[PDB]
Design an enzyme around this catalytic site. Structure first.
Site, mmCIF file in Angstrom:
data_model
loop_
_atom_site.group_PDB
_atom_site.id
_atom_site.type_symbol
_atom_site.label_atom_id
_atom_site.label_comp_id
_atom_site.label_asym_id
_atom_site.label_seq_id
_atom_site.Cartn_x
_atom_site.Cartn_y
_atom_site.Cartn_z
ATOM 1 N N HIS C 221 0.823 -1.209 0.000
ATOM 2 C CA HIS C 221 0.000 0.000 0.000
ATOM 3 C C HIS C 221 0.859 1.262 0.000
ATOM 4 C CE1 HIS C 221 0.392 -0.884 4.372
ATOM 5 N NE2 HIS C 221 0.445 0.430 4.498
ATOM 6 N N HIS C 260 2.019 3.489 -9.687
ATOM 7 C CA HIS C 260 1.610 4.004 -8.393
ATOM 8 C C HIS C 260 0.140 3.675 -8.161
ATOM 9 C CE1 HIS C 260 4.606 6.126 -6.026
ATOM 10 N NE2 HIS C 260 5.154 6.599 -7.131
ATOM 11 N N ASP C 316 8.839 2.136 -7.296
ATOM 12 C CA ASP C 316 9.171 1.475 -6.038
ATOM 13 C C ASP C 316 10.097 0.286 -6.270
ATOM 14 O OD1 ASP C 316 8.779 -0.280 -3.580
ATOM 15 O OD2 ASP C 316 7.556 1.453 -3.022
#
Lengths: 401, 397, 397, 394
Positions: C221, C260, C316
């Site tokens: 998350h 994202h 990420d």
């Protein structure tokens, strides 16, 4: 094979189930005696007088005050560890905390007195259960509690197992006696690697602490301990009774394997199994039952009705029921092997003087075949297959440049 | 039967052959990681091979710090041998990725982990030995370095006094390395027997050895040097030597320090350490035990005893006097003797894990007790020195 | 709702702007505190502002003996995320002078306080991010040594060799800074709003930051490398590449999540970072985790199925890869998303403190309970799992 | 926008219900664990159900052994709620059931995991948290025995004085039990929204409740009745009734803590808290300050100005009076205000796993797009530490 040395503590024939502790058969000791009683029987040969051992029990009681060194060495150990490594480390520290007891620096004639034999045996017996319980309840988080000495060995361990400093806590007789009998059943086994190494440790005139250190470290390996947890996880992952049919046929066509119903030492008649079964029923009465216990009961009842188990001699063994019992006392699987070691030391110590008084055992030359180059001459590193211990350098690019 | 091809001893001639190599050939020019890789794999370490080996040895020279808490745990007057075995027990515990408690049996089959832990323990042991030496004086411990090879890096560990700009005297480093290499490995011994006996029985390499090294604590060889030391001390002046020369031949007082129970022809180690003893006398000086030792060496040979009895100054004599020269305390010799043997245990352990065909069966035994007895209760039991008295008994009386 | 003069996200298009400043020109040649000030105070600062801000944040970092003792011995049964959350929770009290609820009724309304606070909190994290590694391998504590830049000191906290006389690497600091600016600001997301406006009125600033980072720990998350840790394992070096690239087409073996939570189509930032990524590729060594990812990124950005479902490795994934290649553990994935995200949330905190558009969310609950039910007293009433740890209950008996 | 059936605030009329159960049939005919079960499951437990549920809650209270290290490990003037958050943040690194990294898919799915975590929370809350009050008192932690009532257990562990078999007075325990139900849950204050949002995010419960309690101290729901305490000082002696209230009718004298944010009408909660306050009066006495509060309240109840504006004191005022009557520190009050709310979180927790991320909308106000220049030509903080050493050296 080819016996070069003798054993005088016992004669054993597992293929026939003949247990001959000093001439006395196993069943009488199991159903009538106690742990100090069998200890005296094995170390001295004969059976003792009340006083003979009253004195023995009272001598053992006047111990179990272990130095803080072991206590903060085991509290200084991270929560993730193995408790029996804790045992061996604290017992090595006992080697350290008694430099007066070693013969290693005062010559190989220091150990000629019976008094030092008595003192070392009584100290070891007094110290071991406190250390085992301390490691247990330290792994449980609670700091090692101090010893109160008014109960028998098993019951004093029970108080040491958990007391919270309470004086009101009284031992439970049924579980104490069944645990004592289980201790008796595992008081000795045919010479393992531990006893073989310990006889020569005694031949070397080294501290008894260190000798039994080598013995218990031999007991560490999954060769000995890798059965109880294997059977426990076998029962855990086989799960519900509905997974028993597709499992039993799985061993009939040889596509699934059962662990705990077979052992070369006893594939056949062994009334010790019946004894531990009755003790198991008593334990069930005294504490209850668990789902795995019920699944195991159903599985064994199906096995008796199945020809494959009996025909192939696949009957439940001592390890199976015993591990169920260790679970029944609320003991974790990880704390299984230590429970297999507290009694064995007795028999091991029974060999110590027995190995000390046998002239044959000495420092030896083992035999070997040296097929390497008989004559290869050195070469200077001027005119001059493996990764050479490839060290992964990926987390060392920021902490080691 | 159990068989291995690690090394050979010619008992009559006193020849040590680490894969056919005479020990003198090694000690002439070898380095410690070089001979470690040599014997533990039976092949010489090449330029790239030895470079990578010494690289790996120097990298993980850092020892964990939990074992530093451990060494702070043991008391001041503790015998460093128990300290050492306790330290490696704690180290075992301190490598969960390397123990069989949670990784099964396959963990000790892959060659990569095998080496990794081999070089790991090879790094760890001398660091803890140096820690024992330094804490023996109660002085705060020190960090390891990485800019050298084995023996001189250890010496840089030994002498810093809080100054990290020290260096090893290369002559002293080389002589210490030769001292280490001389006691590297002997063909299967009692401690080695216990070593591979534990090793092949599926146990964690750490504490595994922990024991094998505690096996040396016994006075089989851990007290041999103390014997010659105390005899030479109690002898005293050179004037006592002649009558004692008669005295040893009078069988009233025995003499150890001359020869070998397994080597007779010779032990080139004695010659090389005699040369190094001359060198260490040159480089550090003379002390009363030293000239009494050399006077005994010159005088005892003249007497007909060693001419007819044959007792040739054993490596023990020179090793003990050199240990006295290097500033080693009296009690610190056994751990120093322990440092070299680790290579032999590692080689034997790796070889034992290598061959599954070698087994340790269950030995037979012949009972020497009664064939049948029976249990009676105790109430009727028809009728010691277990506890010391006059101390608490009188206290209660 | 909230007014945004701080930063805008075009999640469905792919342009991000720090106060109307496109990511390209800004992130290429800026610095972490420069971005911090620009977001903080609207228009860009000057050299005097640079000196004041940098000097204050550098000087206001060190902690003498604080939350370090809460760690350095406490068990690590999970990621240090909980460790860091507890760390800053205790930092909230080790300096009680930095609290508005203990003097008067409000204190962050004072400009001087808010300024000194924000300076420290932007610079306070390094000293405990140091301990974030100090309890995974076990080296002793090293001084913060506040005499360098942000990332320079922060990496010296990891790269010091336990030495007070080591110089930290600078290109690593530059990479850390550029990646910080890469993950600098996002609009309202998982707990990101739930912290900011909650500290708008609020009672503290440390607590809001700790709560946000604690709520942003889970595998997907806001983090994305914890999940794909296993999907990067077990796939060999080159031989399992065809296997995985066919299974991903057949959906049998694929990744966890890309893009994202608002960005899925285009992101121009990480691309240039990806180029700098390959600069990392030849300097930080090689291991199976990185080379496989090279071919994954080459394939899972233009292959058929990936462009069918818009599956290119997210920012990420690249950040976790670059960081783990730096020399970081296989777990220090979320502890560093904190460093720039905190600064973004500090800017959010100041802005929300400025504009009074932080409103509580009204309820639209669906009450399925009956409007009235009568008495059901226990006394006239007549007879969950309740499974418990009941290992032993007959012990006391 | 949150849709749930946990509770219904009805401000205009004052009809609160726990899964449909009003306070009028609960505060006098139920126990706090019973209401806890009800709000977990939406239905009343039975006597055997209540027996096993109370057994489950009591039996599991195993505090981790590290907390003793932490509590005696910080500067000793720490804030009480600060010590609370420090201790439970320390807990956050203890139990490995709260790591989403380990349980990739099976985090909180089985009812076993659910209720096991529920009890693992509830059992050790005061022992983790409220036992830190002993530190400010200056006494070592006292281990609880789960053979008393849960409120009795709390009073035992906090008040024992150093006795193994102490007996808490079994009259105050009922009041302390009821005080939870009196102010158990309230919708969307500041932090219940945070709890539902984080539970939507799908995280563990430890860090979740840590952030929640850290955010509770917001002085609009954390400073529930601290401020009025200062008012209780400016009145001084009761003889300041008329002159003050007319000054309030002149709107010139400061006031606090009247009415409520979401409640403005009659409430039987007011009657029950008045009765409980006077009972705690009768059993453990007062100071003149409590009598000053009584006098000002009786003045407010007969002043026309407050009747015109439908003004009645908030529940937090009488809650603070009751907490002062039992002789607990006023700044310790937030501890006595955070225990019940977490319960309504847990059911929320469960219910939040039964029905998302929910990013809200916003309006951009800054500049849209502009060019950037490197920092060299960016030429031409806000504090400079006026006590400058350089200015003190130059």
């Amino acid at each position: 094979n080819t016996a070069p040395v003798r054993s005088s503590i016992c004669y054993i024939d597992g293929d026939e189930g003949i247990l001959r502790y000093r001439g006395y058969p196993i069943e009488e000791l199991a159903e009538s005696s106690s742990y100090p009683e069998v200890a005296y029987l094995l170390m001295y040969g004969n059976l003792p007088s009340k006083s003979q051992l009253a004195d023995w029990e009272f001598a053992i009681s006047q111990h179990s005050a272990v130095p803080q060194g072991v206590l903060d060495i085991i509290q200084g150990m991270p929560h993730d560890a193995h408790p029996m490594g804790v045992l061996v480390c604290a017992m090595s520290a006992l080697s350290v905390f008694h430099p007066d007891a070693n013969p290693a620096l005062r010559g190989q004639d220091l150990y000629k007195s019976k008094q030092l034999r008595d003192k070392q045996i009584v100290r070891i017996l007094g110290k071991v259960p406190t250390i085992a319980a301390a490691a247990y309840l330290r792994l449980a988080g609670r700091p090692p509690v101090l010893p109160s000495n008014n109960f028998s060995y098993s019951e004093n361990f029970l108080y040491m197992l958990d007391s919270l400093g309470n004086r009101s806590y009284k031992p439970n007789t049924r579980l104490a006696r069944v645990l004592d009998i289980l201790f008796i059943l595992h008081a000795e086994h045919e010479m393992n690697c531990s006893t073989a190494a310990a006889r020569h440790l005694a031949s070397s005139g080294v501290d008894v602490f260190t000798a039994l250190a080598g013995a218990v470290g031999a007991l560490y390996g999954p060769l000995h301990g890798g059965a109880n947890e294997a059977v426990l996880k076998m029962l855990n992952e086989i799960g519900t009774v509905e997974n028993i049919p597709d499992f039993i046929e799985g061993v009939k066509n040889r596509k699934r394997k059962m662990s705990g119903f077979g052992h070369r030492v006893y594939k056949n008649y062994d009334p010790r199994a019946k004894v531990i079964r009755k003790l198991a029923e008593e334990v069930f009465s005294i504490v209850g039952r668990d789902p795995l216990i019920e699944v195991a009961i159903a599985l064994e009842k199906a096995a008796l009705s199945d020809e494959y188990f009996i025909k192939r001699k696949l009957y439940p063994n001592v390890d199976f029921y015993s591990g169920l019992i260790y679970r029944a006392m609320g003991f974790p699987t990880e704390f299984f092997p230590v429970l297999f070691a507290i009694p064995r030391m007795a028999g091991y110590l029974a060999h110590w003087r027995e190995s000390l008084d046998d002239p044959d055992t000495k420092i030896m030359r083992p035999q070997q075949v040296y097929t390497g180059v008989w004559l290869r001459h050195y070469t200077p590193l001027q005119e001059r297959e493996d990764k050479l211990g490839q060290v992964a350098v990926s987390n060392a690019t920021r902490r080691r440049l």
